[PDB]
Design a protein around this ligand. Structure first.
Ligand SMILES: *[C@@H]1O[C@H](CO)[C@@H](O)[C@H](O)[C@H]1NC(C)=O
Lengths: 33, 33
């Protein structure tokens, strides 16, 4: 589950049945170094 | 209106009816920080 596979819209307070997990950002390891 | 929503092809000298605006790049605030 990455940012190029999913898209952001709204918040977790609207979707019925949303699970809490993590989404990997490919920009973070490139910018940390 | 961002780069992840629009694609670049040609320039503003060809397409009729193009207007000037600013496009927000999400990479820039992350790179500056
Ligand atoms: C994560 O999702 C669960 C699912 O309902 C929620 O209860 C919780 O408040 C969310 N946030 C957390 C665990 O920080």
């Amino acid at each position: 589950i990455t940012t190029d596979n999913t898209f952001v819209s709204g918040n977790c307070d609207v979707v019925i049945g949303i699970v809490n997990n993590t989404v990997y950002d490919p920009l973070q390891p490139e910018l940390d170094s």
